[PDB]
Design a protein around this nucleic acid. Sequence first.
RNA 1: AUUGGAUAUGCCAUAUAAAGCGCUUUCGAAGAGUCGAGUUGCAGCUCUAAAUGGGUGGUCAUCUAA
RNA 2: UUGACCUCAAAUCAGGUAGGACUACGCGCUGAUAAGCGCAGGAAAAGAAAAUAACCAUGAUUCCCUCAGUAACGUGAAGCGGGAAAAGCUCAAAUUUGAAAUCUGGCAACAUUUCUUUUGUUGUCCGAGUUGUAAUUUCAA
Lengths: 49, 67, 115, 186, 85, 166, 391
Amino acid sequence: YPDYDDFFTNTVRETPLSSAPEPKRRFAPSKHEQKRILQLAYAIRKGRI
Amino acid sequence: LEEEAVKKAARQSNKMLPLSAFEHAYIQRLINKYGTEDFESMAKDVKLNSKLFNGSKLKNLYIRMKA
Amino acid sequence: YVKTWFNQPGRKLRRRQARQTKAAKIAPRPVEAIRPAVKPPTIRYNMKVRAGRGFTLEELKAAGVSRRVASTIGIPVDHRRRNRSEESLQRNVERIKVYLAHLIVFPRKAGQPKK
Amino acid sequence: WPEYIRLQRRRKILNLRLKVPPAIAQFQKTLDKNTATQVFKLLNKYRPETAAEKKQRLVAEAEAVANGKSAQDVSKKPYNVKYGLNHVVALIEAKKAKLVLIASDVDPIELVVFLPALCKKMGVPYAIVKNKARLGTVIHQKTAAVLAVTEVREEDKNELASIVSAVDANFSAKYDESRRKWGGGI
Amino acid sequence: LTKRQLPERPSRRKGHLSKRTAFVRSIVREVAGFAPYERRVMELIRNSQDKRARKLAKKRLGTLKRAKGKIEELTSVIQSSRLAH
Amino acid sequence: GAYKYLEELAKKKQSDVNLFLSRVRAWEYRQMNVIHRASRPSRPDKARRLGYKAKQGYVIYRIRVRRGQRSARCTAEERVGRYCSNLRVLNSYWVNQDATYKFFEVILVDPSHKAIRRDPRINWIVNPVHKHRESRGLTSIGKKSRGIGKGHRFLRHNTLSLRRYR
Amino acid sequence: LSENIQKAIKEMGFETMTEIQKRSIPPLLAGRDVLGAAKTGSGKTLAFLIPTIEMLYALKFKPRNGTGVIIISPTRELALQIFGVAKELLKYHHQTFGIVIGGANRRAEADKLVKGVNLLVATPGRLLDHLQNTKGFVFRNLRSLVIDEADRILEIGFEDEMRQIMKILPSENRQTLEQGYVVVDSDKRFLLLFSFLKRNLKKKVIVFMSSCASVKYMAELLNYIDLPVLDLHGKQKQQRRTNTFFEFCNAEKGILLCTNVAARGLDIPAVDWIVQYDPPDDPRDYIHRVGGKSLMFLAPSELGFLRYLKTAKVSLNEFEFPANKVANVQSQLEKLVSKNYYLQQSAKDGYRSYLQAYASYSLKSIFDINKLDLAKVAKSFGFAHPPNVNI
RNA sequence: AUUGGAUAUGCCAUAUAAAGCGCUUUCGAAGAGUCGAGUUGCAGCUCUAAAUGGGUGGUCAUCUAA
RNA sequence: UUGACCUCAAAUCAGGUAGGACUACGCGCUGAUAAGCGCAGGAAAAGAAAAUAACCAUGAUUCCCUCAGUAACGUGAAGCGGGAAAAGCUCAAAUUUGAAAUCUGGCAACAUUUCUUUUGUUGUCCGAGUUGUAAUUUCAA
């Protein structure tokens, strides 16, 4: 029953880890909603909602 | 079989797309602020490029704008 | 415990029928797609040429047919065979380039929303 | 006693009588009563919109579009707490999260046993709070496992810099040797 | 014949560790601790019973390639735990 | 996500954390029934990888088997499949063992549930050819057992072939 | 020359060939190997590639004919200056033309070379990984391996690479070819600049960076923080770049943002303030460029250049300013870099290259990549956690 | 009378969308009490891995299991 | 006192589901292939390489002829070649995080039928699901 060997997580890493760039879909209106709005908007013209 | 495969692809050949009411106005608002040539800086427009469209995609609609 | 061949005239006709019932649906297009020309791999047969499985990803790119529009017009693809030498590549472009020269794809009607 | 209750008190005590490894030992020492009442007060502004009333604003968004109006051009980037285990592991690896909250009762304990080690490495201040269901109430769920603030608005940034300082000073600044020794065996 | 240089198959890049996977293993190496023979080896690699240490890994793992990989694996732990502790 | 960390952790099976949960859960698994239903998969990554989606119709069971001659994992697919006569078996993995019992879980899918039946990634198992797959040696470990692979490692002659013309 | 390349050259804004180009373009177009020894900014970039682009055009090569030429470049700052003209000249051509530098994606740069790039502008390090390590990168269909900056490539430290790499590639039937200082911290690097750019808004100011992308990011943030300025690089478009240097030199007061690579040879006018926001990489060229005022922000852990200029018998004075006067506007610079999608993609691709300049620093003892602070070099750019850059 | 895939044509559609391929100064995740060794009748028992790694074949070629 | 959540129960609860028979042919289990046990379909098993090869390379699986009574050790292959048929692919592993975009179920309308017996759409209310349901991708990338 030894102590906790935190040999690696002792320090702090300063960088992020994943390096793939930030996608463009986090800086614009949620295009899944914009599709969702058009399903509701269409539904008004058919008069179901 | 040559004739059936050409006249069918003669009336079903035009693939021009008229824009929607919004798609016309979205480009319309963009084109009156910087002109009709400098499409490459419209991916850096903060407000009116609210969809963050491409530098290429706006030209795709701009062809669909006129024809 | 035998294997008797009394059906051998019958599998010939059953194959013959089912090869004509295949052609009923595909009436204007061949009953089998074009296969490449690949050289056998042993020392014995390396001077022969015979049909293989399909056209590679760079036999097909060099001929103008993408890997997605390939299997629509009846061109088998082999994602495993690779073109080691030009001769393996120049022989099989002239399988595709003659095939595209002799083939007529009927057009289709599209789904562009109007108004 | 019924057929199952005499198990239900014994797996309570076999977690006590055995030797808890230091990785699991920190999952019973827990954020206190007091400082675990302000964290959830800050979070109770940033709840995800209830799925019934997100649709309610969507029919109010899709009715003006059917006439010609819009709000997408003036829609500011939303805010809420960020939840889900797989979405919060990537919010720590990308150094986007600023306060990670770990439930103290996840049933397979391997689900969260790497998080107090990942939060120590990536420099994301962390705390282990009670009752996974208490997190579940925040985000309109039955049982949540973890949450995370990644961005509060400019309104509560000054509040958040204070409440984290309560989280390190009580969980991280303390509990520093009980995470480094075995537990149980009482 | 006129032979080409082919590019590499995208499957031959299996077996290459990324920077994100190597960060996953490093975290889980310590948070899972050490097995009830790998505690024994770390002692024998610390007070330099090297020939005795390599004898146990071969007997337990089965093959020198593994029995050498652990050495390289566990010796990195002690040389990083002398800077932590 | 968390499944990357949970795969590499599940490999260090003898280390202190993976051994402490082994002793603890082998205690709870042993006082339960020989076959008893789970509510969540104990290994929610291995189950997720072997096919289990967390929707209605996917049923996790778990069963101990006596050690010490059909392969134990194969019988855990059969004994659960004889206890559930409706559920279709997908896989069965290892979760724990001790000196006297190996513990497994099994992924089972309801073919009558109109959520499996409407889903085109798991709709292959509604078909009637997949009736008691674990019986015919048609699953993950029933294929490995009977040497069904690709490689030189793993009546067709015993009959004389008397053609018409010879 | 061909009309398709001449009209592009007409669009490039170059009509009169240089005096050195007058003695080289005639022999190079005829295939005569020339031992190039020219000054910086003496047309060595445009002239050498002018006969090389036509030589492959005379061969009429498609994309699959392999790498028909090579232009060895000794620096990432030089490579972007080399491939930039290469990307501007052959727009009316057909084949491929790209770059291969040090400090990039060694699998998204190899994937470019498997198809076959005609004019692959190369660094002295990454080209050694092409001929030997990479599989599928055929260079055995080449016509001329152009080389530039023989005196600088030999001083890079890879003097054994140019002879070892050339032993594998095709060679037969192919021809070859007083100072001002500001001791600033790593954190408040541009904080002194953002204050100085606002305090000296009505004077002749020239700001120099060590990377093309370094100018392509801070110029966008300056115009987004209400501080317009003109760039001497643009989008690697020579039409506006020729107009920018004409407009900036004619302007008596203004801010001039430019890379030091393109600044060599350009007509440096009498700027009241001459600034180098990044450290210089050329030890002899930057000192000679001084001969208004000139002052560059010196890093805290980079006093070697001060010990080098003092050893070079050059005076240096540290004109100071109170730290309380330095604006603490690095909080809105953490919000702007968080919201804008294009300003961030410039601030991530700007700090990516501006760290590789510290990797390829010729002053190895003075500027050390592994001896600086990784944290504070991002809070000046605008990123809280410095982005994931491949070293 | 039920039914097939089609052909033409009518009405709807919602497309603020989705897809092929260039071009990459960017990234590229890959299945464990399994593999493997020892050993009893492909199974049993003991032990128990790795990331240009692992497998099968002649330093090379070829594949990417659990 | 009260309220969530986990686990475990109970119900002639709502809706479903499993046995049993034939077994020529299929696939497993042990087994003196025979017998016994188990399990499906109109076919089934197999299947898109952790495969061969040593060539100027072949290219999922199945089957026939040949290899051949040959290598190897009385037993006894396989690669190649020649035919028939050829169709490919789907997940796990990367954050939808500018929004669980997913789905079962109850009720009500609208249809629709091999069919008043069938099969769905739309609206609505729980419920499942953040211990991960959709979009995206499967290394050929």
